Design a protein around this ligand. Structure first.
Ligand SMILES: [Cl-]
Ligand SMILES: [Cl-]
Ligand SMILES: [Zn+2]
Ligand SMILES: [Zn+2]
Lengths: 235, 238
């Protein structure tokens, strides 16, 4: 029937920031809820990117690997990607100009958006969380390997979600975009990028499923400090 | 299937309902597909909804607590298929806060949801039911105002409630949110406080939440991130 129009989420972003780095949600159980998405891995060991319908791990020492079916994640956002709009670019366009386009076709901030870009990127600045060790602290005071890596004139795939401003804490407020190269050898959490040329797929989503963990690490965590927003708009 | 369907469903949001969005097109019949248990309000804020044993009632500011009709529509509601893991009987008087103490002690983690139901005799109870609104649809803090507080005394009835994580304010009603109907099914409303004479409390925890965003233009243009939110919701729900 009517395709599965749901944002599935193993959660919370507030939890990931609180210091809950280990979940029991599997890559396999993620693929059950979509063919498309992003997130991280247990112990914050690099970035996850998922598309059509392949899961990759983007690690800290640069590099990237194909995700193994039974790896687990403390936070991930999946969906069956079914775009409704599309724009093609011949002239170079920035990350914001992409967001302008999407905002124009989907003005209401009260909805979710899934977006995918396939093309050649003139520049791209990324960050990538490094594998952690106990005691698991916040996602601030990382260590801080948040050094900014730079890609140049690389072909690749972009995967992203737009999350309502009022949903911060639950997910990443605003645009959250991940990147992997056509080689599948590099990428990460995008801070900014600019497109030389490419194809932008996107669509709005109205349904959100949140899967709250049952492990003690999640159960004992305080997910309501009034710090949050500047802390997450810092990852 | 093989795995329990224990999910908190809502047609949303509380911030949307607060902002002034008073009409959705989710029907009562739609809600029942997502639970036999729950609460909320009706379109044009026409009273309170309470659901238990898949029976749906409309609690009115009017006071004419009537049985809801399957085609009736709601701008906000919370449902679940009630599957309690705990049962507790009270032989001596206990307050709303003492009942909350029981639940908070058995389910200490605030990061999960709780569904709660009480059958029995209520010594006292205070309710406030929202009255049917006309345009311009306003923020719930604007109260215009047929929202008096009523006191029920020595009434048998059914209580239906949810406990929502403190960090999900705006999405739902943070903390304890409870509705009440008399054994008469002719009275009740949104609870502000209550005192249980004696009765049976059953409750359980839920790890899954399903949010269903409407597509109507009123929802699309509503401000769901006001500086007002937290205190405003708590002011409207006490
Ligand atoms: Cl991330
Ligand atoms: Cl309500
Ligand atoms: Zn990211
Ligand atoms: Zn209520």
């Amino acid at each position: 029937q009517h395709p599965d129009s749901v944002i599935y989420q193993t959660s919370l972003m507030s939890a990931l920031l609180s210091g809950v780095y280990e979940g029991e949600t599997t890559i396999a159980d993620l693929l059950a809820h979509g063919d498309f998405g992003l997130g991280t891995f247990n112990e914050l060991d690099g970035e996850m990117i998922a598309f059509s319908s392949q899961v990759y791990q983007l690690r800290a020492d640069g590099s990237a690997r194909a995700a193994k079916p039974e790896q687990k994640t403390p936070f991930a956002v999946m969906t069956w990607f079914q775009p409704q709009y599309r724009k093609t670019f011949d002239t170079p366009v920035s990350r914001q100009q992409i967001h302008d386009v999407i905002d124009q076709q989907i003005p209401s901030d009260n909805l979710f958006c899934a977006l995918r870009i396939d093309g050649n990127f003139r520049h791209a600045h990324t960050r990538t969380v490094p594998r952690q060790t106990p005691p698991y602290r916040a996602m601030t005071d990382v260590l801080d390997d948040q050094p900014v890596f730079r890609f140049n004139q690389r072909e690749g795939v972009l995967v992203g979600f737009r999350t309502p401003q009022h949903m911060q804490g639950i997910n990443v407020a605003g645009y959250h975009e991940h990147f992997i190269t056509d080689d599948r050898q590099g990428g990460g959490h995008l801070l900014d990028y600019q497109l030389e040329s490419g194809v932008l797929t996107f669509g709005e989503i109205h349904k959100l499923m949140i899967d709250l963990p049952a492990d003690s690490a999640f159960l004992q965590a305080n997910l309501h400090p009034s710090n949050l927003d500047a802390a997450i708009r810092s990852v």
